[PDB]
């Protein structure tokens, strides 16, 4: 929905008790190429943390902005690994914080602490305001009430029984009620409107499921209990993949037929509206420069699910090389086209259906279409002379006035267009090759001294040409064409006179040097 949706704020809490430290009974076979070592089983906490990290990676790639994530390990103490600022919502910072936390202690104090501390820290964290929420509240003065701060908290732990699950549910209900009550009086703390809770429970494979799965259950109009349960290892990874796919309204893609295996891409769901559980768009032959401008109705970022795999790496490297890739929906019809705009893989959504703007009227029959002397090349030069570029440094115009470069471009276009004849036959000064220095210099906002000497040389050359009675372009006597030429130059210069004093200078120099009868 809006920017501050229910998925806008996501808080993760991870079990850190010594009970969450043993292996998950899923020993791996890293030894490929004598007698290899015993197979190594990754600990349940390690699997949960790494799968959570993958969830974070997918969410960051698909949504670089407007979506932050915290991380609260649940140990004897309550530690938050990153704040809500966009600058602190980084993958490497999370990795460094997790490394600093270290593996769970095996035999420190198993029964000293529980996960409830993480839950209360999370709900206490959830009531905070992000930077974007603060900006929204500031801009909506005296009306900063329609700002839904709904979030979502996900918990990973190994509960011994469903009774503990219910106890945690009641505890989180009570503590969020207390947090809402505390936020009612306070000003710099928004009251939670919708805090969805997920309580994934993990266990080593080969052990029974101590807790049965439960469906949605709203213990309050501010909570949603959706506690899932699954074995550790790859199952947890798939559960988290499904969670992220159904959290932010995602979709899957199974690009195939890549010359050298298939690859999987995750992106926003709206890219599949043309088709209307993974679509199987097929690679099509990439033409070098057939067409340049397509009709794209969407630009959705993507993130491969196996970024380090050989096929995904090859495809991403090829896209990042610069060339685009055209796909095809399964007689063929062109469809979604991949591209890499500076290092961000975009999955466009072309439009293959019949264009409602087909067979438009011929421009030769519309208004102004029966004239064949248009200054197309002159306007091409005009276009190329006002091309745009970004500016990372905001300068000050006069005094504390940080000018917007867009208004600068607008005023430059206005200055250029003060006297612009449209058709070739209309003008003669612009058609003359002598005035090109004037046509390129006088238009400037502030002519320099070199501009001054160039304009003086140009008017001197024009005077010499008049003295020699050279044949000017036809564009009706020689005196008549000379007179209309001086009229054109005088009209041009006086228009830009107010721009700078040098313009008035060249104006009165022309007035003195003109051969006015």
């Amino acid at each position: 929905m809006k920017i501050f949706s229910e998925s806008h704020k996501t808080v993760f809490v991870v079990d850190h008790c010594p009970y969450m430290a043993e292996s998950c009974r899923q020993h791996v076979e890293f030894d490929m190429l004598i007698i290899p070592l015993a197979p190594i089983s990754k600990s349940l906490w390690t699997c949960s943390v790494e799968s959570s990290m993958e969830y974070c990676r997918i969410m960051y790639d698909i949504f670089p902005f407007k979506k932050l994530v915290n991380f609260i390990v649940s140990d004897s103490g309550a530690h938050v690994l990153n704040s809500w600022t966009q600058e602190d919502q980084n993958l490497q910072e999370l990795m460094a914080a997790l490394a600093a936390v270290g593996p769970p202690n095996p035999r420190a104090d198993p029964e000293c602490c529980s996960i409830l501390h993480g839950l209360v820290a999370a709900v206490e964290t959830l009531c905070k305001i992000t930077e974007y929420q603060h900006e929204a509240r500031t801009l909506l003065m005296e009306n900063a009430e329609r700002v839904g701060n709904r979030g979502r908290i996900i918990c990973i732990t190994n509960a011994k029984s469903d009774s503990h699950v219910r106890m945690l549910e009641d505890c989180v209900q009570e503590t969020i009620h207390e947090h809402n009550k505390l936020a009612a009086n306070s000003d710099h703390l928004m009251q939670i409107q919708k805090c969805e809770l997920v309580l994934i429970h993990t266990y080593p494979v080969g052990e029974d499921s101590l807790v049965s799965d439960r469906s949605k259950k709203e213990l309050s109009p501010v909570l949603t209990s959706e506690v899932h349960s699954v074995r550790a290892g790859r199952h947890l990874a798939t559960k988290l993949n499904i969670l992220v796919q159904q959290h932010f309204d995602l979709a899957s893609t199974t690009i195939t037929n890549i010359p050298m295996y298939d690859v999987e891409l995750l992106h926003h769901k709206d890219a599949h509206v043309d088709f209307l559980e993974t679509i199987t768009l097929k690679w099509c032959t990439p033409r070098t420069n057939n067409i340049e401008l397509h009709y794209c109705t969407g630009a959705y970022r993507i993130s491969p699910v196996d970024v380090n795999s050989r096929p995904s790496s090859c495809l991403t490297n090829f896209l990042l090389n610069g060339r685009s890739v055209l796909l095809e929906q399964p007689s063929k019809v062109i469809s979604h086209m991949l591209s890499s705009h500076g290092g961000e893989i975009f999955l466009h959504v072309l439009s293959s259906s019949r264009s409602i703007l087909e067979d438009p009227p011929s421009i030769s029959e519309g208004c102004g279409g029966r004239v064949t002397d248009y200054r197309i090349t002159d306007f091409g030069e005009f276009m190329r002379e006002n091309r745009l570029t970004p500016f990372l440094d905001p300068r000050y115009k006069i005094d504390g006035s940080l000018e917007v470069p867009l208004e600068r471009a607008k005023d430059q276009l206005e200055k250029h267009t003060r006297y612009w004849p449209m058709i070739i036959s209309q003008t003669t000064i612009f058609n003359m090759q002598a005035v090109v220095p004037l046509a390129s210099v006088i238009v400037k906002e502030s002519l320099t001294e070199e501009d001054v000497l160039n304009c003086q040389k140009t008017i001197y050359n024009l005077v010499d040409m008049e003295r020699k009675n050279d044949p000017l372009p036809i564009s009706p006597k020689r005196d008549e064409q000379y007179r209309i030429m001086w009229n054109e130059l005088e009209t041009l210069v006086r228009a830009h006179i107010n721009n700078s004093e040098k313009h008035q200078r060249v104006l009165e120099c022309l007035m003195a040097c003109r051969s006015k009868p």
């Binding site: 401008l293 970024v307 893989i345 438009p360 102004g368």
Partner: protein
């Protein structure tokens, strides 16, 4: 795309007792009124596609989408008299033809011609609305059109009083299932032809007036007709619910290279046709226009032109079958509609730049802008979901250890990355294991016996052995196992 759904049911054959003139059937009133609508179309909305499906017990498409309004005009006078009313089937068929022809994103106004006689039951409007609302069961109610439509109902059921006796709440609710995008039109008066003419004039003024605009590029200007009219847009429903519409003037704000622009995500592709304010070619044809010059220059040079349609809105004015014209787009209203162009409110002319960013030879280009934070597929992330990836990493680190000391730096970098990832994931026993494989490869050293190679692998193995303890000796993430000199 306009689909004129005309009810041909027997209910429309009822004569109405008008005063003075002869008896006129409601079907014939409907006839004169659409004739008026199709005229205002062929005269002032010529580019607009339209279709006319007449619905009965079954719905049938007599005339598909076409710009030829003469065919539609004669189609009104060649109509049969099927005699059953069923709106749900008609709406389902309209969805079918719209999706089949255009798709799911193009707006498709629907003109509906009912008579306030929904039906007796079953296929009737009341029976469908009262039952299908509770459950779809793959029989989803077609009233919520899966595209930004606008349901206009020419309920020519005399005054609102006449249709309030039996059924008008059903119609007004039917409009609401379209999310309020529509309007009920009631002909007030004794069903006179002038009344229905005023009715259809109101419809024309509401929905089918051309969107005239002035295209001002600096100081040059021209009068254009942006076909089709632009739809209003809303940012969201929480912070800014007020819809926004483009300004009457389109100010060209610069130009950008068509290769740099890539293929931008637009809202809707709009034609721009000059409007004069064989006479057209003999008078308006010979006077120099600006749209012709702009389109020709854009085609020849091969660029586009950014446009400012208002505060925070921004579009594009590009050129182009063999036929070509000056079509205009609409970017997403916001600060950065194109994320690879920077904040679109931060684009300046090359004159204000220190040097010429585009280059003297027209080779350099600031576009596209690299995002401030790199993504994952471009960076070097470590993923250990499947055992295959971790096996690939360990195979890579083992193979490069054979090339030691040729690729010493790469092997050290990969080992440091693996150690950092293990420390982040707490995979200390994995670090001990990879130390064991490093020792094993040391035991299987080749007969070359490079002196510096053995020292590096032994030092690395010692580093992993000491770091696997979990103590502060190498717990630091900044530690990268510097190779021995």
């Amino acid at each position: 795309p306009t689909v004129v759904v005309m009810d041909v049911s027997l209910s429309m054959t009822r004569p109405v007792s008008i005063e003075g003139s002869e008896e006129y059937q409601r079907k014939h009133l409907a006839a004169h009124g659409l004739t008026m609508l199709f005229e205002h179309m062929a005269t002032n909305y010529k580019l607009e596609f339209t279709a006319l499906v007449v619905f009965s017990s079954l719905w049938e498409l007599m005339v598909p989408f076409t710009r030829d309004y003469n065919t539609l005009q004669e189609a009104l006078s060649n109509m049969d008299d099927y005699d059953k009313t069923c709106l749900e089937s008609a709406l389902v068929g309209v969805c079918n033809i719209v999706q089949q022809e255009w798709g799911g994103a193009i707006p498709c106004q629907v003109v509906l011609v009912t008579d306030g006689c929904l039906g007796i039951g079953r296929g009737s409007l009341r029976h469908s609305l009262a039952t299908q609302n509770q459950r779809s069961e793959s029989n989803r109610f077609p009233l919520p059109f899966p595209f930004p439509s606008k349901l206009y109902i020419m309920c020519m059921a005399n005054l609102e009083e006449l249709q309030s006796t039996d059924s008008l709440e059903c119609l007004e609710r039917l409009i609401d299932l379209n999310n309020g995008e529509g309007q009920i039109f009631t002909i007030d008066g004794p069903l006179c032809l002038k009344n229905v003419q005023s009715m259809f004039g109101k419809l024309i003024d509401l929905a089918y007036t051309p969107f005239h605009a002035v295209l001002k590029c600096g100081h040059l200007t021209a009068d254009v007709q942006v076909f089709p009219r632009p739809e209003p847009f809303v940012v969201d429903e929480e912070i800014d619910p007020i819809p926004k519409v483009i300004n009457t003037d389109l100010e060209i704000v610069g130009f950008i290279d068509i290769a740099d622009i890539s293929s931008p995500p637009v809202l809707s592709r709009h034609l721009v046709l000059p409007i004069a304010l064989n006479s057209a070619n003999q008078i308006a044809g010979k006077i120099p226009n600006f749209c012709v010059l702009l389109h020709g220059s854009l085609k020849v040079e091969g660029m586009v032109a950014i446009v400012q349609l208002g505060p925070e809105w921004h579009g594009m004015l590009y050129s182009q079958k063999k036929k070509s014209n000056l079509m205009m787009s609409l970017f997403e209203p916001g600060p950065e509609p194109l994320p690879w162009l920077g904040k679109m409110a931060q684009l300046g002319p090359i004159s204000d730049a220190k040097e010429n960013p585009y280059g003297e030879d027209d080779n350099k280009s600031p576009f596209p802008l690299q995002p401030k934070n790199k993504r994952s597929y471009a960076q070097n992330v470590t993923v250990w979901i499947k055992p295959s990836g971790l096996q690939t990493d360990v195979q890579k680190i083992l193979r490069n250890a054979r090339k030691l000391p040729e690729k010493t730096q790469t092997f050290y970098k990969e080992l440091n990355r693996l150690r950092k990832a293990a420390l982040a994931f707490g995979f200390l026993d994995l670090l001990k294991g990879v130390a064991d494989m490093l020792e094993r490869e040391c035991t299987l050293l080749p007969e070359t016996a490079h002196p510096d190679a053995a020292f590096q692998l032994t030092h690395a193995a010692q580093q992993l052995k000491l770091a696997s303890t979990g103590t502060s000796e190498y717990a630091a993430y900044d530690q990268n196992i510097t190779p021995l000199h």
